């Protein structure tokens, strides 16, 4: 029952700072001591600091000082770590977590992670290619997401029925815009027969495009 | 000096298999009070890390028997007995006694069959043209193991540049892996070229899968 809600993604620009919360319910939160934890993308994880709400008793990681500030507020059981003088080094996804005594001596509970992306570009609407075939039992077709920033970004194929024999890969940094791609594969009695449709949601923009896969020739 | 290291950096196991991950930490990081805090971690893909292990060998309510950690002084072990598909992810050992310190983890693949991908290429789309960009995509899908290698040819020659590749993490359900690779260049030089080839050598195979298609076709 224990449960560390924490804030929503951050696009920050280099130089700034963040503040990003730790919401916990379902212990005393000022009986025990609260971790910090940042991983950056395709990284391990890494200590920053740690602080005991009861107090405000705090210990930083040497690499962490000056860069990190924790608070925690009692009355809102709510623990925060503020990240100053920002740089592309602390985009990352930070996690919150409390370490048990007694029944167990560890972080048994994590919050389920903040993203920070620190960066000086603005917010870009993907642009959405079909990937058809130029010219077997099944086929493979594809969605080009081109050009965005920053993430994430949702991917479906008809709106979600088409699910199985999808894989949606990771999105890559093109100069300061992200770029991923979507492939599918189905029977060829179901396409080009039936049409087939990429949905492309792109947040940060409040974007939703959808594109017919046309056949080609 | 409080450096916590694992090996290996993968490993590979097919299912009902044993496996063992180590960690070893510099110095002795017995606490004063006579205890030792070492615990394990697992974070499969987009999650949040789970606790798995405490005190060395002390399980956390609601792990398997298949996990156990054990060793002292410098050098701790984390054994699977038996390795389930649920199983794959990355194992990261942390030291808990002050200056909380993370080993780099140790990623779990599940061995399977070896199986060639599945290559598909397509031409760039009359939409992208239109914006004066020119995109090239190849998938290679569902192959087991990894370790693969793709060479994108523009009428025989080796083009490095504006070659951008993305991989996903082992499939839970198949335990295959995927990759895309884009080859991206501007329309006037897409249109100056005729015939655009994917290559990928692979361990299942001499003879390379090659996919391409003729602009003049």
């Known amino acids: 029952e224990v449960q560390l809600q924490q804030s929503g993604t951050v696009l920050a620009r280099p130089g700034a700072s963040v503040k990003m919360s730790c919401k916990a319910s379902?212990?005393?939160?000022?009986?025990?001591?609260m971790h910090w934890i940042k991983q950056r993308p395709g990284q391990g994880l890494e200590w920053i600091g740690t602080?005991?709400?009861?107090?405000?008793?705090?210990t930083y990681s040497q690499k962490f000082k000056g860069k990190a500030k924790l608070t925690a507020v009692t009355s809102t059981s709510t623990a925060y770590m503020e990240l100053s003088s920002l740089t592309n080094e602390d985009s990352a996804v930070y996690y919150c977590?409390?370490?048990?005594?007694?029944?167990?001596?560890?972080?048994?509970?994590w919050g389920q992670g903040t993203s920070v992306t620190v960066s000086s570009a603005k917010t870009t609407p993907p642009s959405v290619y079909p990937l058809a075939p130029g010219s077997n039992s099944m086929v493979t077709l594809g969605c080009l997401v081109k050009g965005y920033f920053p993430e994430p970004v949702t991917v479906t194929w008809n709106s979600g029925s088409l699910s199985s024999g999808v894989h949606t890969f990771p999105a890559v940094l093109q100069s300061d815009l992200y770029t991923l791609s979507s492939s599918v594969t189905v029977p060829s009695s179901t396409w080009p027969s039936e049409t087939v449709t990429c949905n492309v949601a792109h947040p940060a923009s409040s974007t939703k495009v959808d594109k017919k896969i046309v056949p080609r020739d | 000096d409080v450096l916590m290291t694992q090996t290996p950096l993968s490993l590979p196991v097919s299912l009902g298999d044993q496996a063992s991950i180590s960690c070893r930490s510099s110095?002795?990081?017995?606490?004063?009070?006579?205890?030792?805090?070492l615990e394990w971690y697992l974070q499969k893909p987009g999650q949040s890390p789970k606790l798995l292990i405490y005190?060395?060998?002390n399980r956390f309510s609601g792990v398997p028997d298949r996990f156990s950690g054990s060793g002292s002084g410098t050098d701790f072990t984390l054994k699977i007995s038996r390795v389930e598909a649920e199983d794959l992810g990355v194992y990261y050992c942390?030291?808990?006694?002050?200056?909380?310190?993370f080993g780099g983890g140790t990623k779990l693949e599940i061995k399977r069959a070896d199986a060639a991908p599945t290559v598909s290429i397509f031409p760039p789309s009359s939409e992208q043209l239109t914006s004066g960009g020119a995109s090239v995509v190849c998938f290679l899908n569902n192959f087991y193991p990894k370790d693969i290698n793709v060479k994108w040819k523009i009428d025989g020659s080796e083009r490095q540049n504006g070659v951008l590749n993305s991989w996903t993490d082992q499939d839970s359900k198949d335990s295959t892996y995927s990759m895309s690779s884009t080859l991206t260049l501007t329309k006037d030089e897409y249109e100056r070229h005729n015939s655009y080839t994917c290559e990928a050598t692979h361990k299942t195979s001499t003879s390379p899968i090659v996919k391409s298609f003729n602009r003049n076709e």
């Open positions: 379902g212990y005393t939160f000022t009986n025990y001591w």
């Open positions: 110095q002795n990081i017995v606490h004063s009070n006579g205890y030792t805090y």
């Open positions: 005190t060395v060998s």
């Open positions: 977590s409390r370490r048990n005594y007694g029944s167990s001596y560890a972080m048994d509970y």
């Open positions: 942390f030291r808990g006694s002050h200056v909380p310190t």
């Open positions: 602080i005991y709400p009861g107090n405000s008793d705090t």
